[PDB]
Amino acid sequence: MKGDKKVIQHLNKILGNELIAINQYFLHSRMWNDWGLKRLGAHEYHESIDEMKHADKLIERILFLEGLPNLQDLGKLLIGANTQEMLQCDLNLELKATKDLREAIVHCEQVHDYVSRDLLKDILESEEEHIDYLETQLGLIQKVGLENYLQSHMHE
Amino acid sequence: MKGDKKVIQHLNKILGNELIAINQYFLHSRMWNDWGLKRLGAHEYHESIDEMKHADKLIERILFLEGLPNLQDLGKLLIGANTQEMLQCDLNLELKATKDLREAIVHCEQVHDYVSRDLLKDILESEEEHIDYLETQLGLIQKVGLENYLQSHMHE
Amino acid sequence: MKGDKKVIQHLNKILGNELIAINQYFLHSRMWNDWGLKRLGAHEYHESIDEMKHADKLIERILFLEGLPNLQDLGKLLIGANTQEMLQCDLNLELKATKDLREAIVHCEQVHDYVSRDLLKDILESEEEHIDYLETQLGLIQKVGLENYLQSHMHE
Amino acid sequence: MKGDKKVIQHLNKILGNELIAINQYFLHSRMWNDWGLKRLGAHEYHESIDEMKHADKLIERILFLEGLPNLQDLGKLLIGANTQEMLQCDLNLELKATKDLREAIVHCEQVHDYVSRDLLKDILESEEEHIDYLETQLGLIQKVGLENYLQSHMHE
Amino acid sequence: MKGDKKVIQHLNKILGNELIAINQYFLHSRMWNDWGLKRLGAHEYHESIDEMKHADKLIERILFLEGLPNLQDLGKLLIGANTQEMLQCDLNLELKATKDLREAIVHCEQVHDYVSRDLLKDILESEEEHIDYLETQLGLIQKVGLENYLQSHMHE
Amino acid sequence: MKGDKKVIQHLNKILGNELIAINQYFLHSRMWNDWGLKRLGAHEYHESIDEMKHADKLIERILFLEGLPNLQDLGKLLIGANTQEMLQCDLNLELKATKDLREAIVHCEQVHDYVSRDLLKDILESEEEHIDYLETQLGLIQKVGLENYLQSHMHE
Amino acid sequence: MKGDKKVIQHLNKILGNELIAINQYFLHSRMWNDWGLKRLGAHEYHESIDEMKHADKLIERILFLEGLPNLQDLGKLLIGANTQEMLQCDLNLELKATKDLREAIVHCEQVHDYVSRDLLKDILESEEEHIDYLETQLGLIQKVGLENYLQSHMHE
Amino acid sequence: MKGDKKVIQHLNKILGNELIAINQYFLHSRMWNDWGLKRLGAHEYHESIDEMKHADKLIERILFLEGLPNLQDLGKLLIGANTQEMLQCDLNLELKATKDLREAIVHCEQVHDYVSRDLLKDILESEEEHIDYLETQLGLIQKVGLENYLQSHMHE
Ligand code: HEM
Ligand code: HEM
Ligand code: HEM
Ligand code: HEM
Ligand SMILES: [K+]
Ligand SMILES: [K+]
Ligand SMILES: [K+]
């Protein structure tokens, strides 16, 4: 079913974002495991699977709309070098992502692609939850102290 | 455990190849699903996942060796336009990946990184099993014909 | 809860389309069975139950809004004479139904009937999935040939 | 994630409506239980639980958006003295609650808080379902007569 | 038990033929698996096992009759170039085998070795069941075409 | 994958050795059953099966490398006439076979066919385990006496 | 099976390193248990089991190659006086040990003792995994603080 | 608990005997497995585990009494070259171990360390159970003959 050209562009933009987040979060997860923060490495691993699942849904939507999913153009990974910076890097990406989700939803609505809007809104709900997690983690570092924070994520 | 700088470099080259394969195969899977060749899309999906797992091990070995895993630099996806092209592209990708795996194993031997060698060999075994799959599909397209081959991959 | 008059007109329009589809898809199903294409007959039967359930949800919503559901007016069925026409006729019908759905959703948002919009959106998502199936089937008749496509749909 | 000040004002306005509904439906339930109308009691109890669960989701969402949920300001409970009064009071409350949900959804949409909109639309759907229930009971009273309607709600 | 010298000789010829069949059918099996015709691969494998169990029974009997089993002399494998010739090569071999089997049986009856005879008839029956399978496949290639026959044996 | 001609010749040589072992162990197995040493017949039968499984793995590899497995050329069986000779015969062959296995691994490294090397190393470990069993069996005959060694192998 | 003199020399060297780790890690385990750091004691107890199983494999290999395992000679145990020093001592011992495994693997390849090489590579992998653990723990002691690190290992 | 200094010397002397017994019985065990006398090898393996378990109890006690357990000094293993010599080496070793245990118990009593005394008495009881096994095996060799004796420990 031929979709709106700019909807497909918006979708391919969100996909771009999901593709960065997949790589960024898989690396942070394997970093945290390598440092012995097993509980963070495991949580971050599932945040990366979630983004893979969003990508799958966006790729399927684009092919159905007779577009070309663009898995080639990979933007800037935000790699942290310590725990707080990695969580902050995850948050700065998710916030870039949700800005682009709002603009894409705005446009689906103008062109009446109500199903693409519903799909993006479900991704946006997932991303807002992840923002809530990340912001909470940066909160706890402050409330229990960095040493305690890292101590609480050594084991599962 | 600080490892050979060039072993890490080899590991990241193998990692870069895996990241292409992941995207290229995942894209091909969802194209075969879009066209209703669901037996092909399922099988290509699991090739995409197998490369996802090799990437996981490579990343873990790189971080253990105190290298920095490179997930930023995505090489060239080989995206086909029809079933015979998509299979042939995957095969070309796989043949380049096995050239690189062999060179990396040769280097692991020289510097005595026998465990990295063993990982790369397990991946190499897997990449050769995929090449057997691919060569065999292209062979079947000639033995039964393209129409019959697509027919047989319509349903699971 | 007295609903908006034009919303009720729009829901009755959608309902009229659903009623056509019910009958068109059920006849096509039964013709496919009569011809020995049982995979098609079975698939299309479920396609028409799904329309039946959509019509249930529209009938309930119209009565809740204190309108009178119109099951008396039945528009033109698009009945095909062979598997390729029958598939294309189904698609032509779904394409007219998504146009009406989008127009009914537009009005629902104008008058803040956000619950009716969400019901229509869920129907629209269903309709598009059907469109995906039909386009794909027609695409397969081209890729594998009609004789092979029909053969693949003789047996369950 | 700092949300929009008027979004939070609206959410808290929706929250305050739930907080009335909880108290009002919970008292009416205990009144019907006290009178021996156990089926009305048990059903109204579950309507209070439903509003309690809506209030939780609002509270959760207001805090994520970094506002302060307002559980201090309690508006006018509409307590009835007999079944007909109480059903009508419940229905007047829910008709107020839906007017306020529509105004807030209009505002979430204007600022692109699409997640807050979906949350409010989900509550809106539950409230309309309660309105069907209420209008229907008041309709049954006229059809079967007050003394028969009460009879049918004595037992569970 | 000291057996007849020419019975042992006949037995050891029958064993020679089983040994060709074992290797020939196993290589055809793995050949069909290399080509992706897993249904012929699976079936021809079980024919190889079946000839293995016959060879077992002939060795036990030869030794009980106090002769030396001959596993050293291996006749000519007829290895086929494609699916059709592999089936015809198996059939050629089985037809030679049935002939030796009937001479062996004739002689067994002459010297009153009725138990050897009964073992040989049991093998002969299995050989004729296999000849039926072989003739039947070759007929299916003429009836449905080579492309269709091969397609039907891609998937198990 | 066209493999190295010399690798394919090495594999075909290792296959020839396994083909000899299959027949040799199978005959020794069935002689020990004819003589009442069931525990030896049972153990040796499984040595025959394990060689058959090596044979299988090599055929699949040779075909994958686009060579032609040689099942036609059957070297000299070393059949013994009494228990100690049969054991010593089995041992002579396994020592011949490990030597060839080592020569082919050497050549698989020189040409970077690490997967083939891995398969041959697995076979080699198994053939070394058979050598331990054989040396040990012969050593036990020295320690307990041949009468006692055969007695200990009458029953399972 | 008479093995190479220098391979047996190398193998007895690995065993002697295993016997040191066995005792060192057991003692450290019982020290952590005595101080009430039961989680460290349990894990250290299991690393000591791990070295006990490698020693078993080395002993069995040496004896198969008709060497004499040397369980008499016992090198310097590196015993720490506190958690940080005990982990560092384990790490220094594991680093001496992987050096000797590498030299041993080198010599195994020279004389074509491919089975011994594969057993030592298996050990080498286990040692590296254990090295990753030790470095990770020292890193955590830095990043969470010693008191917090110890606290996390009081209980199981 | 500041333990008596001579108790702790005694305890480390019994520990040093245990450490010899561990390595000696383990070595004999793998020697008997390698010769195919699997029953002796299994029984000797468990004798080694039991001494490992005594050693662990001693280490804990020494640490409790605030001694430094001594795993560095390893005395003279008694390794035989055949079964009877091995059995008699174990018996010589156990006979030295129980003389040291009796001496350590005496001193424990004289200083009122009744808990250490009890631990030692339980080890002694087990050492006397091993002496009973050993003496009985040597007597069996005399009664049934070494050839029969060894025959009876060939299999499990
Ligand atoms: C650096 C790149 C990637 C890495 C390291 C990676 C890693 C993984 C891993 C480890 C798994 C779990 C497999 C298993 O244990 O069975 C997985 C699953 C999966 N991956 Fe990836 N992946 C990557 C990229 C992608 C991409 C590009 C996509 C799709 C566009 C994707 C889609 C999926 C999906 C759908 C699953 C299944 C998860 C589920 O349904 O539970 N991944 N990936
Ligand atoms: C206004 C028109 C119709 C409505 C609202 C309607 C509604 C429904 C619903 C809700 C179901 C049950 C779905 C479920 O399993 O949840 C159903 C079942 C079914 N309908 Fe319809 N339907 C309509 C017209 C038709 C027509 C025209 C036909 C055939 C010519 C038909 C044939 C069937 C059949 C065979 C079933 C299966 C029921 C069973 O086996 O239990 N329906 N319908
Ligand atoms: C090319 C030479 C041969 C090959 C490649 C081969 C292969 C095999 C394989 C793969 C199996 C199955 C093992 C499993 O269960 O995974 C098997 C079983 C067996 N083989 Fe062979 N074989 C060969 C020659 C022989 C010969 C010469 C004999 C006897 C004279 C024989 C007798 C048997 C028997 C009795 C079984 C057990 C069958 C059953 O009951 O399942 N094989 N063989
Ligand atoms: C040459 C030296 C040693 C060797 C070859 C050895 C070998 C083994 C083996 C193979 C096991 C069985 C573990 C399993 O398979 O799960 C074991 C268990 C064990 N070892 Fe040792 N070990 C040695 C020295 C020691 C020492 C010196 C100690 C104590 C100071 C010790 C303490 C233990 C304990 C407590 C167990 C568990 C026993 C049980 O409950 O089963 N080992 N050992
Ligand atoms: K066909
Ligand atoms: K703490
Ligand atoms: K005896």
Side-chain angles (χ1 to χ4, degrees), chain A residues 1 3-4 7-56 58-75 77-95 97-98 100-109 111-156, chain B residues 1 3-4 7-56 58-75 77-95 97-98 100-128 130-156, chain C residues 1 3-4 7-56 58-75 77-98 100-109 111-156, chain D residues 1 3-4 7-56 58-75 77-95 97-98 100-109 111-156, chain E residues 1 3-4 7-56 58-95 97-98 100-156, chain F residues 1 3-4 7-56 58-75 77-95 97-98 100-109 111-156, chain G residues 1 3-4 7-12 14-56 58-75 77-95 97-98 100-109 111-142 144-156, chain H residues 1 3-4 7-56 58-75 77-95 97-98 100-109 111-156:
Chain A
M1 188 172 85
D4 168 270
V7 162
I8 289 140
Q9 296 188 19
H10 273 293
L11 294 180
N12 260 317
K13 189 178 192 173
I14 314 302
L15 178 65
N17 292 343
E18 304 302 335
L19 288 163
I20 299 159
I22 292 165
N23 282 9
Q24 173 177 323
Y25 302 166
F26 207 82
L27 173 62
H28 284 165
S29 148
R30 266 46 189 150
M31 292 172 67
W32 270 317
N33 280 337
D34 160 59
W35 294 344
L37 305 177
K38 257 57 167 106
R39 175 155 184 156
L40 272 159
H43 186 277
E44 187 85 344
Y45 165 87
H46 290 109
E47 293 295 348
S48 156
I49 298 282
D50 291 341
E51 295 294 43
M52 294 168 209
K53 284 165 176 190
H54 298 343
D56 188 17
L58 290 154
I59 288 158
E60 288 171 359
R61 181 64 175 170
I62 287 158
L63 291 178
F64 167 73
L65 299 178
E66 316 208 342
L68 307 170
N70 174 0
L71 287 83
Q72 181 62 95
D73 293 336
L74 181 62
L77 276 47
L78 312 170
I79 317 306
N82 60 82
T83 287
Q84 178 169 279
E85 181 173 83
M86 298 146 70
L87 292 155
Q88 265 162 349
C89 277
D90 285 10
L91 184 51
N92 278 334
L93 191 68
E94 278 290 9
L95 283 173
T98 49
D100 288 342
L101 281 162
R102 299 190 205 274
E103 298 169 345
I105 285 161
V106 160
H107 185 72
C108 287
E109 187 67 19
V111 299
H112 310 330
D113 192 350
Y114 302 124
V115 175
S116 295
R117 162 170 176 151
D118 213 58
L119 169 54
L120 296 186
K121 173 268 286 170
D122 282 329
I123 293 168
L124 174 66
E125 180 182 14
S126 185
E127 305 300 44
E128 273 174 34
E129 282 179 9
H130 190 207
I131 283 157
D132 183 21
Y133 170 85
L134 295 166
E135 284 175 341
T136 301
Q137 293 331 277
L138 294 160
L140 288 166
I141 297 171
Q142 282 140 211
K143 294 189 182 78
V144 307
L146 177 55
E147 286 185 346
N148 276 341
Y149 182 81
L150 314 168
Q151 190 194 10
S152 296
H153 296 275
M154 285 175 55
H155 307 323
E156 309 172 69
Chain B
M1 196 189 80
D4 181 289
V7 175
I8 290 145
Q9 268 154 239
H10 278 285
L11 294 186
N12 262 316
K13 189 167 163 224
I14 308 295
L15 176 54
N17 293 347
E18 300 305 322
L19 296 173
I20 290 162
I22 293 167
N23 291 28
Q24 171 177 321
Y25 301 169
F26 203 89
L27 178 49
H28 280 165
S29 167
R30 270 48 185 141
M31 279 159 74
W32 276 319
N33 286 344
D34 179 39
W35 296 334
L37 304 175
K38 301 211 162 291
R39 191 158 181 137
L40 270 165
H43 184 287
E44 188 79 331
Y45 167 90
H46 284 109
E47 291 300 333
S48 181
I49 298 250
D50 278 348
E51 304 289 16
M52 289 168 197
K53 305 173 161 169
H54 303 148
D56 183 23
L58 283 169
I59 289 156
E60 286 178 354
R61 183 78 185 159
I62 291 167
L63 287 168
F64 164 65
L65 296 180
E66 308 197 22
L68 306 160
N70 187 331
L71 293 90
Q72 182 64 84
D73 299 330
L74 197 58
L77 272 44
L78 311 185
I79 305 313
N82 59 84
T83 287
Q84 185 166 346
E85 245 214 340
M86 292 143 83
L87 296 163
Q88 180 55 53
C89 283
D90 296 350
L91 182 59
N92 290 332
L93 198 74
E94 281 292 0
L95 292 176
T98 56
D100 292 340
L101 280 161
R102 293 176 208 287
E103 277 174 37
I105 293 165
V106 159
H107 184 77
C108 288
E109 257 316 285
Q110 285 177 356
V111 301
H112 306 165
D113 189 344
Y114 298 115
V115 171
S116 301
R117 152 163 197 166
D118 208 65
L119 167 49
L120 296 179
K121 175 271 297 166
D122 279 323
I123 299 160
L124 175 74
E125 179 182 358
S126 171
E127 308 287 312
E128 292 194 7
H130 189 190
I131 284 158
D132 180 43
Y133 170 81
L134 288 163
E135 284 169 343
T136 295
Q137 304 323 115
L138 294 170
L140 283 168
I141 280 170
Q142 270 159 348
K143 292 190 179 74
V144 308
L146 181 61
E147 297 191 357
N148 280 337
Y149 177 81
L150 307 176
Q151 183 187 24
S152 287
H153 289 86
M154 266 203 283
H155 316 137
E156 325 202 50
Chain C
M1 199 184 66
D4 174 86
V7 163
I8 293 166
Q9 284 158 245
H10 270 282
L11 296 172
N12 260 326
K13 190 152 176 175
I14 310 313
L15 170 54
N17 301 343
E18 291 298 355
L19 292 164
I20 291 166
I22 286 162
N23 288 5
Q24 183 176 311
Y25 301 166
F26 201 103
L27 180 52
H28 282 164
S29 160
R30 264 51 189 145
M31 304 168 47
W32 273 322
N33 286 328
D34 183 55
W35 291 339
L37 309 170
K38 303 293 150 80
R39 211 190 193 101
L40 272 174
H43 179 285
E44 184 84 338
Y45 170 90
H46 296 305
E47 279 298 348
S48 103
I49 306 295
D50 281 2
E51 297 298 60
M52 289 165 201
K53 304 175 163 175
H54 297 165
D56 196 12
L58 292 163
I59 287 161
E60 306 185 351
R61 182 70 186 172
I62 288 160
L63 292 169
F64 169 64
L65 298 177
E66 311 195 8
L68 311 153
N70 179 347
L71 289 71
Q72 181 60 83
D73 305 343
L74 181 72
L77 285 35
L78 317 190
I79 309 301
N82 65 79
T83 285
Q84 190 163 34
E85 256 182 36
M86 289 147 78
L87 287 165
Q88 179 64 57
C89 282
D90 283 10
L91 181 50
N92 293 336
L93 194 80
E94 277 302 334
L95 290 162
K96 296 150 190 189
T98 72
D100 290 342
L101 276 156
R102 297 184 212 281
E103 288 166 24
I105 287 160
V106 165
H107 182 65
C108 284
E109 240 253 331
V111 304
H112 316 307
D113 186 352
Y114 302 112
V115 171
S116 283
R117 157 170 175 149
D118 214 64
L119 158 64
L120 293 182
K121 181 271 296 161
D122 289 332
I123 286 149
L124 179 69
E125 180 185 9
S126 201
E127 304 301 40
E128 293 191 5
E129 287 177 347
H130 192 199
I131 293 181
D132 188 16
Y133 165 87
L134 294 156
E135 288 179 330
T136 306
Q137 297 325 111
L138 296 163
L140 282 157
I141 293 177
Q142 296 304 303
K143 294 182 169 60
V144 315
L146 182 75
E147 287 187 351
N148 274 1
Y149 176 83
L150 302 172
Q151 171 190 42
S152 286
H153 283 77
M154 291 176 37
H155 297 153
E156 279 194 280
Chain D
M1 198 179 78
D4 180 82
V7 169
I8 291 155
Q9 294 198 342
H10 270 297
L11 294 174
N12 259 334
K13 178 168 201 139
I14 302 286
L15 172 51
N17 289 335
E18 302 301 356
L19 297 166
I20 300 167
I22 293 159
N23 292 8
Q24 182 180 313
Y25 305 162
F26 197 100
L27 178 67
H28 283 161
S29 159
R30 273 35 196 157
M31 292 172 61
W32 273 318
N33 280 351
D34 183 52
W35 289 332
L37 297 159
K38 303 301 197 197
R39 207 193 170 98
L40 280 161
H43 176 287
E44 182 87 327
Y45 167 83
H46 284 100
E47 290 293 0
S48 199
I49 294 290
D50 287 348
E51 300 296 41
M52 292 167 203
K53 295 175 173 165
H54 294 156
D56 196 358
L58 285 153
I59 284 154
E60 249 144 46
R61 178 72 179 166
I62 293 169
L63 288 164
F64 167 63
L65 297 187
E66 308 179 6
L68 343 94
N70 186 344
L71 288 69
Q72 178 72 80
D73 300 337
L74 188 69
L77 282 64
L78 314 167
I79 314 304
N82 62 41
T83 297
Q84 286 173 279
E85 241 164 55
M86 299 153 72
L87 294 176
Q88 184 63 61
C89 284
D90 281 16
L91 172 60
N92 294 336
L93 185 74
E94 284 293 355
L95 292 161
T98 51
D100 281 323
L101 279 158
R102 288 176 217 290
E103 279 162 29
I105 282 163
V106 165
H107 177 69
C108 297
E109 189 68 13
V111 294
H112 317 326
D113 194 345
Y114 298 120
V115 172
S116 288
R117 162 183 178 133
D118 215 63
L119 170 63
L120 293 178
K121 174 267 291 176
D122 280 347
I123 297 184
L124 177 61
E125 165 165 21
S126 170
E127 304 298 22
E128 283 183 17
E129 272 166 351
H130 193 198
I131 291 175
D132 192 26
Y133 170 85
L134 287 166
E135 290 167 346
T136 295
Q137 304 322 292
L138 290 159
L140 285 160
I141 285 171
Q142 290 297 300
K143 295 185 182 52
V144 314
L146 181 53
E147 54 279 332
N148 287 269
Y149 175 82
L150 296 175
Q151 189 187 17
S152 259
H153 291 283
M154 229 180 289
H155 299 141
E156 307 155 273
Chain E
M1 204 172 83
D4 205 83
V7 169
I8 279 133
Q9 284 181 353
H10 272 292
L11 289 187
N12 250 343
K13 173 180 251 225
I14 306 310
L15 178 46
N17 301 325
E18 298 295 345
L19 289 162
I20 310 187
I22 291 163
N23 295 359
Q24 179 175 314
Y25 300 166
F26 208 86
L27 177 62
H28 283 163
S29 173
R30 269 50 193 143
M31 285 171 64
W32 275 312
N33 286 340
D34 192 35
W35 296 336
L37 306 169
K38 307 295 180 53
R39 192 179 194 95
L40 286 162
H43 183 99
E44 186 85 342
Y45 171 93
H46 289 286
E47 298 288 345
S48 183
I49 303 292
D50 280 4
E51 292 295 65
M52 283 169 216
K53 305 185 181 159
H54 298 154
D56 196 12
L58 295 158
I59 299 163
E60 300 184 343
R61 176 85 185 163
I62 291 169
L63 291 165
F64 162 70
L65 299 186
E66 298 185 24
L68 313 196
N70 188 348
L71 293 74
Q72 180 65 83
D73 296 338
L74 185 57
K76 168 88 222 211
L77 289 58
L78 313 169
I79 302 304
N82 57 27
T83 282
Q84 205 201 293
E85 195 198 30
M86 295 148 71
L87 291 150
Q88 175 74 62
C89 281
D90 295 353
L91 179 67
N92 283 339
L93 190 77
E94 288 291 318
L95 291 173
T98 59
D100 291 338
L101 276 165
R102 295 183 215 278
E103 298 173 21
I105 283 157
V106 166
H107 181 77
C108 283
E109 183 77 11
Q110 234 103 60
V111 304
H112 311 291
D113 188 345
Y114 301 112
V115 169
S116 289
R117 158 166 184 162
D118 203 74
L119 171 55
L120 294 177
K121 177 267 294 161
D122 283 347
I123 286 152
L124 177 56
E125 185 195 347
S126 181
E127 303 307 49
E128 288 182 11
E129 287 170 1
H130 190 213
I131 284 162
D132 186 29
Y133 165 87
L134 289 166
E135 291 171 340
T136 296
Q137 303 326 105
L138 287 167
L140 286 170
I141 291 169
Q142 296 302 303
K143 297 171 120 78
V144 310
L146 179 54
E147 277 192 6
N148 273 0
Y149 182 78
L150 292 181
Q151 177 190 43
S152 275
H153 288 90
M154 267 185 265
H155 299 144
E156 242 168 288
Chain F
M1 230 177 44
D4 206 67
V7 161
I8 280 153
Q9 286 174 21
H10 272 303
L11 295 176
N12 260 318
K13 178 163 205 200
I14 310 292
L15 173 60
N17 289 326
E18 313 271 21
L19 284 168
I20 300 169
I22 293 173
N23 290 21
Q24 182 172 310
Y25 302 160
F26 205 90
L27 184 59
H28 284 157
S29 171
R30 267 43 181 148
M31 294 166 65
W32 276 321
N33 287 336
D34 188 28
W35 293 345
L37 305 183
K38 310 301 198 177
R39 198 204 182 93
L40 272 174
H43 183 270
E44 182 89 332
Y45 169 90
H46 292 105
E47 295 294 347
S48 191
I49 298 297
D50 296 337
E51 299 293 31
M52 291 167 205
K53 293 167 161 206
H54 299 344
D56 197 16
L58 287 160
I59 288 158
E60 297 175 342
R61 183 70 181 169
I62 289 170
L63 291 166
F64 166 65
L65 297 170
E66 305 181 7
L68 298 150
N70 185 6
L71 282 75
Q72 178 76 84
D73 295 344
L74 181 68
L77 276 49
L78 317 180
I79 309 304
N82 65 64
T83 286
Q84 189 144 27
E85 179 162 59
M86 298 149 66
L87 290 160
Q88 180 63 67
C89 281
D90 292 355
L91 182 55
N92 288 335
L93 195 71
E94 284 294 6
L95 287 174
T98 50
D100 289 322
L101 271 163
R102 291 178 209 286
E103 276 154 11
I105 282 155
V106 169
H107 187 71
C108 285
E109 263 294 306
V111 311
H112 301 352
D113 185 356
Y114 301 119
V115 160
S116 285
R117 158 164 183 171
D118 201 49
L119 156 69
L120 293 177
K121 176 267 287 157
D122 288 352
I123 297 182
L124 178 62
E125 174 184 314
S126 169
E127 305 294 8
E128 281 193 12
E129 284 166 18
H130 196 192
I131 288 170
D132 184 19
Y133 167 79
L134 288 164
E135 291 173 327
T136 295
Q137 289 341 96
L138 287 169
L140 285 167
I141 288 167
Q142 290 319 300
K143 300 194 162 57
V144 307
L146 178 75
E147 287 198 338
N148 272 342
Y149 179 81
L150 302 176
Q151 168 180 39
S152 278
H153 286 86
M154 279 193 287
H155 309 146
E156 288 152 293
Chain G
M1 181 173 111
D4 172 273
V7 170
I8 298 161
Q9 277 194 75
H10 276 287
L11 290 166
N12 271 318
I14 308 304
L15 172 60
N17 294 345
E18 286 296 336
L19 302 164
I20 290 159
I22 290 170
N23 294 353
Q24 176 174 315
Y25 302 161
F26 207 94
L27 181 57
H28 280 161
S29 162
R30 270 57 190 134
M31 283 161 67
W32 277 316
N33 280 347
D34 172 49
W35 297 331
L37 300 161
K38 308 290 208 185
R39 192 180 173 122
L40 270 168
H43 185 97
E44 191 68 345
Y45 166 90
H46 280 110
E47 291 298 351
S48 171
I49 303 298
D50 275 355
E51 302 293 36
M52 286 174 210
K53 310 182 156 147
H54 303 153
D56 187 38
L58 293 167
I59 288 158
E60 295 189 11
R61 186 70 181 156
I62 293 170
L63 284 182
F64 163 68
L65 307 173
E66 320 193 6
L68 300 193
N70 176 11
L71 289 75
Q72 183 65 86
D73 302 343
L74 184 66
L77 275 42
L78 313 173
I79 309 303
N82 51 85
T83 291
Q84 179 156 205
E85 178 188 30
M86 297 155 73
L87 294 161
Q88 182 67 65
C89 281
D90 288 351
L91 172 54
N92 291 326
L93 189 78
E94 278 300 353
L95 285 171
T98 59
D100 293 344
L101 283 153
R102 281 167 226 287
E103 296 186 15
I105 285 156
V106 169
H107 179 80
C108 282
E109 189 74 19
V111 304
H112 307 313
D113 191 341
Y114 293 124
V115 173
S116 292
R117 155 164 183 156
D118 187 66
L119 156 63
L120 295 177
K121 178 268 298 169
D122 283 341
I123 297 180
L124 180 60
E125 188 170 321
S126 190
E127 302 299 44
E128 276 179 16
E129 287 177 352
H130 184 198
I131 280 174
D132 181 15
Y133 167 79
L134 295 162
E135 303 170 318
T136 305
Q137 302 322 122
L138 297 156
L140 285 164
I141 286 178
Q142 298 299 316
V144 311
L146 177 63
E147 300 200 333
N148 273 332
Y149 181 80
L150 293 167
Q151 176 189 44
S152 273
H153 290 96
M154 280 177 46
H155 310 317
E156 311 128 316
Chain H
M1 211 173 71
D4 184 72
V7 170
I8 291 168
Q9 292 171 32
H10 270 296
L11 288 176
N12 259 320
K13 184 190 194 182
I14 313 306
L15 177 57
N17 286 343
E18 299 285 355
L19 293 169
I20 301 175
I22 292 171
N23 289 11
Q24 177 172 315
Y25 306 157
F26 206 89
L27 178 49
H28 285 154
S29 166
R30 274 43 193 139
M31 291 172 51
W32 272 314
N33 283 338
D34 181 54
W35 300 331
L37 295 158
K38 265 66 159 73
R39 204 184 185 96
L40 278 157
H43 183 277
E44 192 77 338
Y45 168 89
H46 285 102
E47 288 301 347
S48 176
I49 305 288
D50 286 343
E51 291 286 56
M52 284 163 208
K53 294 191 202 175
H54 299 334
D56 184 26
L58 283 159
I59 292 155
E60 296 186 352
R61 183 75 185 160
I62 296 169
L63 288 166
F64 169 57
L65 300 179
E66 307 186 20
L68 286 178
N70 181 354
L71 289 86
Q72 183 70 77
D73 305 330
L74 181 66
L77 279 53
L78 311 177
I79 316 301
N82 60 75
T83 288
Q84 181 154 68
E85 198 174 293
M86 297 151 68
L87 284 169
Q88 173 72 66
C89 289
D90 292 358
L91 176 57
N92 293 338
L93 192 72
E94 279 299 2
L95 283 182
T98 64
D100 288 329
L101 281 157
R102 299 178 203 288
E103 274 170 21
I105 284 165
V106 168
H107 180 74
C108 285
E109 184 74 20
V111 294
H112 306 345
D113 185 344
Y114 297 119
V115 172
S116 302
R117 168 179 180 147
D118 203 64
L119 171 58
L120 297 178
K121 176 272 291 166
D122 292 345
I123 288 151
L124 175 65
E125 184 179 329
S126 161
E127 306 302 34
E128 271 177 23
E129 272 169 328
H130 193 194
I131 282 152
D132 184 22
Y133 172 73
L134 291 159
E135 294 189 314
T136 298
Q137 304 320 111
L138 297 164
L140 285 167
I141 294 173
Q142 289 307 300
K143 297 183 165 39
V144 308
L146 180 71
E147 278 182 349
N148 286 336
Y149 179 76
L150 300 173
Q151 174 186 37
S152 298
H153 293 69
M154 244 190 283
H155 309 310
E156 295 173 82

